[PDB]
Design a protein around this ligand. Sequence first.
Ligand code: FMN
Ligand code: SF4
Ligand code: SF4
Ligand code: SF4
Ligand code: FES
Ligand code: FES
Ligand code: K
Lengths: 263, 87, 432, 45, 214
Amino acid sequence: SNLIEVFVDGQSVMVEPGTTVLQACEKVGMQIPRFCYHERLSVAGNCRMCLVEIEKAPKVVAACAMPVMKGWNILTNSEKSKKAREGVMEFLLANHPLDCPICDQGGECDLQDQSMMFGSDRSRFLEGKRAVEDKNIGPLVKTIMTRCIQCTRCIRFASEIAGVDDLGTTGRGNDMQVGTYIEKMFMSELSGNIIDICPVGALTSKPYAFTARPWETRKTESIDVMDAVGSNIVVSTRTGEVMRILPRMHEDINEEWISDKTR
Amino acid sequence: SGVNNTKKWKMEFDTRERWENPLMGWSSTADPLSNLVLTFSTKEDAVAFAEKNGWSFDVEERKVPKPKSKSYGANFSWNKRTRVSTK
Amino acid sequence: PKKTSFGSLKDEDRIFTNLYGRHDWRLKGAQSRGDWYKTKEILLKGPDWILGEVKTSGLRGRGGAGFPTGLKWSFMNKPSDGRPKYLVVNADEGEPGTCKDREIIRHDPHKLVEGCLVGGRAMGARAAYIYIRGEFYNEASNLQVAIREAYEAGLIGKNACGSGYDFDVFVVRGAGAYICGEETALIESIEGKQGKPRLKPPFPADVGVFGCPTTVANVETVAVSPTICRRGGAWFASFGRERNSGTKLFNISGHVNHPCTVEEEMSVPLKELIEKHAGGVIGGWDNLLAVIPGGSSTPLIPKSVCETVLMDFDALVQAQTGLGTAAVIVMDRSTDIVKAIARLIEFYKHESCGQCTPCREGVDWMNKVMARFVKGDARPAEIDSLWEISKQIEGHTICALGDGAAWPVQGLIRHFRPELEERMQQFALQHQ
Amino acid sequence: EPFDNSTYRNLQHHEYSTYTFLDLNVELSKFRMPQPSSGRQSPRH
Amino acid sequence: GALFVHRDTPENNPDTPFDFTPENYKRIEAIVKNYPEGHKAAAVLPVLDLAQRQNGWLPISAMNKVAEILQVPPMRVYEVATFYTMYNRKPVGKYHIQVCTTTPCMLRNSDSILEAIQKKLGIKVGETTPDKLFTLIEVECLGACVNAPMVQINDNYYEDLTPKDIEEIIDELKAGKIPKPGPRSGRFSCEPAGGLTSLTEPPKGPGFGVQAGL
Ligand SMILES: Cc1cc2nc3c(=O)[nH]c(=O)nc-3n(C[C@H](O)[C@H](O)[C@H](O)COP(=O)(O)O)c2cc1C
Ligand code: SF4
Ligand code: SF4
Ligand code: SF4
Ligand code: FES
Ligand code: FES
Ligand SMILES: [K+]
């Protein structure tokens, strides 16, 4: 019908008008690297790791917020697109503290996985590193703001998903402290899901803290029974007991969110 | 956020009794078949695998992501409430 | 026909005839200069006239954008969509070297607000939202009295200049930033938000503020509009070369004897502006080591290249820099170019909003490594390393500040490369 | 009336009170058109 | 003071008695009317500006009070306060010295000016006098880079400013007398020091170059 035609690194595909570049990539199976966009959580466009070069481009387009139109060959594996990813990632990783052994995100961290696939293999940093003072917003989720990369995924999650305005990014320049500025607490009924949207170990579950590592956690599929919603969840079991509970992908029942009581 | 796991089919079993070893607190298990999962590209071969050795058999349909109608101008609206409160 | 000897701007040729505030800067002197006259007629003629006059005017982007405003003002000129159209004047002027609009806001605001209303007719807007800089408090009250004398006279407001037009003009005094200098972060400053550059598309044109169409323009670009639309755009376009059509309030500062924001004929070699109008520089042409051509973002130019080039957009572009806001800064041999942009790049780190990672992380990383460059704590391959990250944050940022930071250091790398090598040589030698 | 060359006529910038910008701000409300309505008075409403 | 987390101190606490004088409600209602209804969050900027011009700072109580009077969540108030420069969340010493330090100014040796009020006033950068008169901060360009190194004192700046000009500016300042703002030298607004070059002949009359009907 009105589905505009467009290419993706060669092969052409029709697509609904108004669709962004990211949402055009996975139609053929391209998961372009992203760090500040969630498919069901607004559009930020600040991580800049979605940067992919279009054909005949003079500049790399941000695939998150660029609507695509007729005849735009998505140059996924292009040298400049990989160059843009390489440069932008090292900037993210530049001020990231060396906490991977002590950080629970280790083994299931998007920052780690990205650096294996789309990343360098050494450092050109020769300076100090930013040190963000920690915060405290509840006993259910830990706060380590030095590991944060300001994807702002939390503040959108609080604003729309949780319906509570208590998260923000105070400061300026390198001093983007994401938190609450004033001392406050975050126990929204979906505040537990703030852990999963975080791509790094900046937000982690205090009850699960320092209890297991992702590779050993055998996963099982079950249901939530705390509530009549009957949310689909995945139970982690290792060495014969349960450590943490994760929401499953079920657009009808729970989407990818679960209540704090369930988590 | 990566999805290079939601693309195949597996052959997982039902978990059985897992008791702690008296000495060293192990997870001694008498289920020989517990730690075994196969990988199947599509599904009917996975089921075609299933009956040929005649195991108790059931499936689950692939939870395909519904198309999210994304936008960026919605965060800056004039009447609609999709105006984002922070950026 | 082609007056290749560009220069020697006449008083009538200066569209701001009171940018110095010498005579009556208030409304009582505005109409004496030529303001608030024949405006009734040009508004009633229809939007196409101002679009037509600005086409032959060729007034390009004077806020550093470098884009023909005739196209941009007509870019969103569409029939009414229900959502009211608005106007915004970029009165930030936070660049280390931007002062002309500060003089304009303080002394020539009536032609500025008239430019909003004559422009508002062109783009079919019903209100202006000029973003006066917060540090500009004294000159903020200067255009509120200009706001005052114009509203009750029917020049602006309901029946704007007596043409059945409801265009208004609101003022938002800032609270201190440069990021709000760029229009995409400017809009959020009005839209009850911390200064964050908005991603385009959606553009400011179709939807600028509170979800409605809006237009963003540099202070002079709207301010010159009534003057070019009254006497003639072709007369304004006579000044300067091709696509360099017009004049510019050159902002002379730095190691210059008599710094002065002079509205002077544009596309003129810098030798003329420093000597004729600024009374020479500190120590003469021999003394000056390099000159910031037109803005802090624009890479500085040394005597080796700036011996002949004309200060025009096209010649500046091929000079691996930009004319921008004509913020010319002179500096001599005595000052060190590294310590010069050291304070400049430090100011950039002190401004970045931190939205996109390249600007948030790279600029601070630039500050640390360049701080070593001041003493010289880097090996020769670090300049290439500094060049590499300079290309990394160039263009990859949401806004143009990130590349606006790349250009000054990039120009310093390409020009004073041996100076960096010898400065580093002294660093290791004295600290052996 | 005669053209001057060494006279500054912007003495008001010196003599501006602390609320001067606010003093004009409170009182230009007279020349105000009906502000556009969003179908509601807040985007949380 | 370089602390983007708020410490609940007994003086600056949510219990601090902040309010507005009768004139302010006319001022802040003048803020809200300037913008279309439906999106009145624009007023969070000038309302917070109003508190700057009343309290001399922004206590956490002021930001919290701004929240409900703006019908906005309290954090959006904090975000506006924390970003922009002179939205000071910390007490300031009467007169705020904003010495312009960026490259065009320092090129004409702002350090001489910075050294001038450093040694004479006797307090370091960002500090306050023991009895609350002066506070010096090394600010960047405010928009008057053409002149000599600038000092923005509270709301009135001082341009074409020399280190010897700065000590006499603060000579009368500590006595309570405010000097004339603007370019301190013979330069009035923007003319060259060695005599004005432009603006010689009288400006043209009202309306020139008529294009027929125009
Ligand atoms: C970091 C940055 C700061 C800017 N500051 C200003 C400014 O102070 N004034 C201005 O008019 N334009 C400024 N601009 C340019 C604007 O983004 C925009 O291009 C300009 O307002 C267009 O003006 P015009 O429509 O008159 O050409 C800035 C851009 C950047 C990237
Ligand atoms: S969040 Fe990721 S990169 Fe950071 S310490 Fe944890 S595992 Fe390492
Ligand atoms: S704490 Fe986590 S979710 Fe929040 S902004 Fe930082 S990285 Fe994003
Ligand atoms: S370049 Fe990026 S971080 Fe810097 S001001 Fe622009 S949007 Fe913010
Ligand atoms: S996905 Fe485009 S920046 Fe994060
Ligand atoms: S240089 Fe002093 S104001 Fe910008
Ligand atoms: K996480």
